[PDB]
């Protein structure tokens, strides 16, 4: 019965309301806001920059969810960074794969 | 909720295998992520029993076997050596163990 | 029965209500991998029976009553088609299936509310022809009605023109607005 | 034999997708076949009154120069003139349509408020209002539709539309749709629609259900997991 | 996010340029709301003008390179907030030409 | 909750419904005394659609939009020859509605996980 | 609260209060339908202490606690010359004081399985 | 936020006269005294009968409808820290605040 207002997974953060029937009569039912917020609690600052600080402060404007910096990675997307991989004398950028499930070329 | 999809309940006779198929969304992230067919211990979450990964367990050691089939987009796990202990609630899933995408499986001997 | 809720089908317009004697314009998706063999297109008989009656087919083979006022135009090619059907004919009211004998077989099915009003482009040849200026953002242009291929012929090729118009100074034509990748209505002269 | 200039508002044309232009003369003598027809100054004199009515019981025997003509002319929308052609009507007159500036232009607000909890208390019936402020040039049609269906114009009731007083070129509307406290309660989406020659697309559906007002309880949750990191 | 520094005497007037997306749904300026901490809007693309503003600012729309300009004016000494200019039906969150007085 | 984004102005409701004579009469009473009229319009009254006798009317009042969240009333009037003493009055405030409560439950443990 | 933990009664009270000229009239109103007399006790004006030209007047109502807790609305009304309507109501149901509790949890290193 | 300050420095032979806003729209008006870091400003005066203990004898008000103002005056003055002396109008105190008057 849940209807899901949002599922934002830049934030982890969904939101989803429901009218909750306690007892058996109008004006008694409940409308809800079931807001559910997963926070990473070890990623960066900069999720695909692997270097950056690590993230403490996790700020989330249920308006600008309602309707720009990511704290999880999406399982769906492909992330990706850049690292030298000095072998030889040949130093070659090459890019790495930070998540590596979502990365496999189709 | 999950789009897993598999056997809501198998059942059997004792020393007689089974085959869970457990359909799964065909993507790439689908297609490349961990099988995982755990046991939803009555306390506790699941221990995983069997993995695509080539993991399995104390148990499952030379009775299971877990195939990945991403073209029909599924996965079956087959058990032999089938036992009266064996039976209870199971999950079939992808990716962590607790985290959702899943389906709940109940097997009775 | 499992439903999957997160499926690679994109959305298809559901209905696609038209103007008596206007035309229309199904967008049938199909899948991008395996491209077209045979794009059939159906009706329906019942709720139970319902055997789709494949108004026309990749040769070309149209039905009785469709003979001419209907076409399928393949393109936009990635991975979908557009069926077109002019002369808005009430009993046409129903659902259409966008059957095609590749893998994956989608039926998408697509409903057609027909309202009987104004029609947005003019009438019948020998040649009138009339889109109105709010629709004529595109390019009103004719086809000669061939059930292998539509090609386009010379007409009044001008600005809105009293509005569009058919000549053929010197069998079943059409005289449609195209956005380009996509089309819009149609015209039928004969 | 009376003479006056009135154009089409938007909400009439948006109903009809074109225009019917109109020069009122009523109260006309009693001639058949009355030959006054709204004249353009362009030269497209619209035909004579189609089926007008010829012998209805009131004396005035109204004869318009109204018909039905072209949606183009107001996709143009110039100043329109009305030159009347009556016998007992000797004196030359033009009267140019009163549209020009019209005004202003501005956007419509349509705010839809779900009703009180006090009369849902009272158990009868639920009055949701549609509201729509700013409206910088009349021109409004407000229809009511729930799941898509158009619903019963009984059911909802418009309003006059009266100016502003935080602006006089403003003009605000209201629309209340009554129905059974069940229906509200059981959830339907009755969701109303504005229709203003300001509108981008030319309308608007602002929308409401008894599941989407203002919430009774929040339950967040925050769980905290140091391996979480890659939302499912 | 830039915050103009402007300063001038009790008749000192203050132009404030603000960037139009060319959207013209509304674009607008917005006084600090120091009392509460949030944002509330003193001109906008509908007349609406704050009645301790009442009639001391005007709004002016170019498309040369898409100006926006609040001008003022007179000037009552009273502490002008940060005039942050934004776009879109939400003020508090839509802000980007930040502007302090 | 839409137009007082805005943060422009907040727009109150009378709304009167079930009058017969049709000569009701709407006031606006703010901080105990009259507003002028001039911020508040009322509408002639119309035939109630889903009955008979009974009749409708609106007034709005609109306002300055932090006035309403400065935490006022606006008291409303409807004053008509039917009701028992002859007026009746309503409040509202920005905490008219009943309360709520909230139930924000933190999970810091490390096994306990979510439900895709 | 005693009178609630009781549960045998409750006796709402309306307080008039520093209104100069002696007679007023209170009556207590429930849904828009007067009460009957025999409910509300109201008492003869009494000169205030601290006001020597005003005086006040309570008016108390007793319904039982169930009704109390079927959360109603018992307005009481006041008629006065000097009150701009000759009459203002005032309206306080079980609901009025209630703030919004927040019932904060804290899940730490527990199980249950349960989904979050 | 206007903030007019009188300071009065007669101290003990001092007395105040302070002219605040006034609205004339027959609502009660009151002259705040924000009490020990409180925030709660409490009324010295108002147009209830209203006289607070301390300011109580020397406080007195009057009125100008025609100037638009309320003029409050303590005539002994007697020093007592003077904080924001806000005058305003409305059934509510603290919000109803309109101009501060230090002294
Ligand atoms: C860290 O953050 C910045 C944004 O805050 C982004 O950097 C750019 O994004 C591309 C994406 O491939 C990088 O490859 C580019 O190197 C970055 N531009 C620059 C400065 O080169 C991205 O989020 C991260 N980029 C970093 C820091 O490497
Ligand atoms: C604690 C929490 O996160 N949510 C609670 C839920 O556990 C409880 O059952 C419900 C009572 O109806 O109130 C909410
Ligand atoms: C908060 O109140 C709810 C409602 O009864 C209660 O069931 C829940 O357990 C309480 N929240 C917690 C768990 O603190
Ligand atoms: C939120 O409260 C509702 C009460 O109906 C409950 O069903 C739901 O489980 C709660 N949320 C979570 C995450 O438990």
Redesign the interface.
């Known amino acids: 019965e849940r209807?899901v207002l949002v599922d934002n997974?830049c934030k982890?953060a969904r939101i989803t309301?429901?009218?909750?029937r306690s007892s058996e009569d109008?004006?008694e039912?409940?409308?809800?806001?079931?807001?559910?917020?997963?926070?990473?609690?070890?990623?960066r600052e900069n999720i695909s920059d692997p270097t950056s600080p690590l993230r403490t402060r996790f700020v989330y404007?249920l308006?600008?969810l309602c309707k720009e910096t990511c704290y999880?990675?999406?399982?769906?997307k492909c992330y990706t960074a850049v690292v030298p991989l000095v072998y030889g004398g040949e130093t070659k950028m090459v890019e790495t794969a930070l998540?590596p499930?979502?990365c496999?070329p189709? | 909720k999950s789009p897993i999809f598999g056997p809501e309940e198998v059942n059997s006779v004792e020393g007689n295998s089974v085959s869970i198929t457990c359909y799964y969304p065909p993507t790439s992230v689908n297609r490349h992520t961990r099988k995982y067919w755990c046991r939803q211990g009555a306390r506790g979450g699941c221990i995983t029993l069997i993995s695509s990964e080539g993991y399995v367990s104390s148990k499952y050691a030379g009775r299971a076997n877990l195939t990945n089939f991403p073209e029909n987009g599924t996965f079956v796990v087959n058990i032999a050596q089938l036992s009266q202990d064996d039976s209870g609630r199971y999950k079939c899933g992808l990716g962590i163990n607790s985290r959702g995408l899943s389906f709940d499986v109940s097997l009775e001997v | 029965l499992f439903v999957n809720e997160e499926s690679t089908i994109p959305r298809s317009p559901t209905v696609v209500k038209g103007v008596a004697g206007g035309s229309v314009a199904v967008l049938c998706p199909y899948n991008r991998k395996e491209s077209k063999s045979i794009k059939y297109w159906c009706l329906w008989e019942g709720a139970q029976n319902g055997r789709c009656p494949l108004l026309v087919d990749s040769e070309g083979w149209v039905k009785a009553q469709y003979e001419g006022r209907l076409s399928l135009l393949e393109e936009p090619g990635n991975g979908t088609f557009t069926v077109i059907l002019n002369q808005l004919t009430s009993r046409d009211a129903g659902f259409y299936w966008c059957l095609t004998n590749g893998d994956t077989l989608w039926r998408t099915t697509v409903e057609i509310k027909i309202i009987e009003g104004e029609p947005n482009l003019k009438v019948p040849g020998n040649v009138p022809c009339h889109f109105p200026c709010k629709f004529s953002s595109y390019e009103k242009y004719w086809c000669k009605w061939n059930n292998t291929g539509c090609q386009a012929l010379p007409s009044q090729d001008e600005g809105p023109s009293k509005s569009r118009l058919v000549s053929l100074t010197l069998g079943w034509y059409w005289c449609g607005v195209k956005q380009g990748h996509f089309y819009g209505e149609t015209a039928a002269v004969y | 034999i009376r003479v006056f200039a009135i154009p089409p508002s938007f909400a009439s044309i948006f109903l009809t997708k074109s225009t019917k232009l109109t020069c009122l003369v009523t109260d006309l003598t009693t001639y058949d076949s009355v030959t006054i027809s709204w004249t353009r100054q362009n030269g497209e004199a619209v035909k004579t009154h189609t089926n007008i009515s010829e012998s209805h019981p009131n004396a005035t025997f109204s004869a318009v120069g109204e018909a039905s003509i072209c949606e183009d002319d107001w996709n143009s929308g110039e100043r329109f003139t009305c030159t009347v052609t009556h016998t007992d009507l000797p004196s030359p007159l033009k009267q140019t349509i009163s549209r020009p500036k019209g005004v202003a232009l501005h956007r419509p607000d349509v705010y839809l408020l779900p009703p009180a909890r006090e009369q849902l208390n009272l158990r009868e019936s639920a009055t949701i209002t549609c509201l729509v402020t700013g409206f910088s040039p009349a021109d409004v049609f407000v229809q009511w539709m729930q799941r898509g269906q158009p619903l019963s114009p009984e059911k909802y009731v418009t309003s006059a539309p009266m100016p502003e007083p935080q602006a006089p070129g403003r003009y605000f509307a209201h629309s209340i749709l009554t129905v059974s406290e069940e229906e509200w309660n059981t959830g339907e989406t009755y969701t109303c629609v504005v229709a203003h020659e300001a509108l981008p697309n030319r309308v608007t559906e602002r929308t409401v259900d008894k599941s989407t007002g203002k919430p009774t309880l929040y339950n967040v949750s925050l769980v905290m997991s140091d391996t979480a990191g890659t939302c499912y | 996010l830039p915050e103009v520094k402007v300063e001038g005497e009790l008749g000192g007037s203050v132009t404030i340029k603000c960037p139009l997306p060319e959207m013209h749904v509304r674009i607008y300026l917005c006084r600090e709301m120091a009392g509460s901490g949030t944002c509330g809007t003193v001109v906008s693309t509908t007349n609406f003008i704050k009645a301790e503003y009442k009639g001391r600012v005007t709004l002016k729309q170019y498309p040369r390179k898409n100006l926006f300009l609040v001008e003022v004016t007179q000037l009552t000494e009273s502490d002008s907030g940060v005039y942050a200019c934004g776009a879109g039906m939400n003020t508090d969150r839509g802000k980007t030409q930040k502007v302090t007085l």
Do not use: F, G, Q, W
């Open positions: 209807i997974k982890c309301s429901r009218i909750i109008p004006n039912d409940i409308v809800e806001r079931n807001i559910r917020i997963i926070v990473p609690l070890n990623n404007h308006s600008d999880t990675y999406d399982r769906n998540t499930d979502a496999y189709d």
